[PDB]
From a paper:
Here we have determined by cryo-electron microscopy (cryo-EM) structures of the head and tail components of YSD1, a phage infecting Salmonella Typhi. We investigated the structure of the recently characterised phage YSD1 as an example of flagellotropic χ-like phages and more generally phages with long, non-contractile tails. Samples of YSD1 imaged by EM showed characteristic features of siphoviruses: an icosahedral capsid and a flexible tail tube of ~220 nm in length. Cryo-EM analysis of YSD1 allowed structure determination of the head and tail components at resolutions of 3.8 Å and 3.5 Å, respectively, and the generation of de novo models for the major capsid (YSD1_17), auxiliary protein (YSD1_16) and tail-tube protein (YSD1_22).
YSD1 has an icosahedral head organised with a T = 7 laevo symmetry. The mature head contains 415 major capsid proteins arranged in hexon and penton capsomers, forming a shell that is remarkably thin for its ~650 Å diameter. This shell is further decorated by trimers of the auxiliary protein located at each threefold or pseudo threefold position. First, a clamp formed by two loops, C1 and C2 immobilises the E-loop around the threefold axes. Second, trimers of the auxiliary protein dock at the threefold axes over the clamp and E-loop locking in place this critical capsomer interface. In both YSD1 and λ, the N-terminus of the auxiliary protein staples neighbouring capsomers by interactions around the twofold axis augmenting the major capsid β-sheet of the E-loop/N-terminal arm. However, in the flagellotropic χ-like phages, an additional hook-like structure formed by an N-terminal extension connects trimers of the auxiliary proteins. This interaction mediates the formation of an external protein network that braces the inner capsid shell.
Numbering used by the authors:
A (entry chain C), B (entry chain B): 2 to 51
The structure:
């Protein structure tokens, strides 16, 4: 004391919230492209006929 | 873009319908005959009589 109260310091309590990955388990593939759009093709192939 | 866009194509999504063999599993014997017809004989012998 006197001019100023003396202190001891203890360890700093650092909480660190995260947002852990859950829905990215269903998105396995990473495909990069330097192009404008991404197109797909869906094709239904009717086979089961006598 | 400009005149028209560019495209990165991913894999073709092929919906394909089959009809797997459930009834053929009781028909094991295969006969590749060149003749006309196929003759069977069935014989029932009644013995259980007094």
């Amino acid at each position: 004391a006197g001019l100023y109260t003396t202190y001891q310091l203890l360890e700093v309590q650092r909480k660190l919230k995260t947002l852990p990955a859950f829905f990215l388990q269903w998105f396995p593939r990473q495909i990069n492209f330097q192009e404008d759009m991404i197109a797909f093709d869906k094709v239904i192939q009717d086979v089961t006929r006598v």
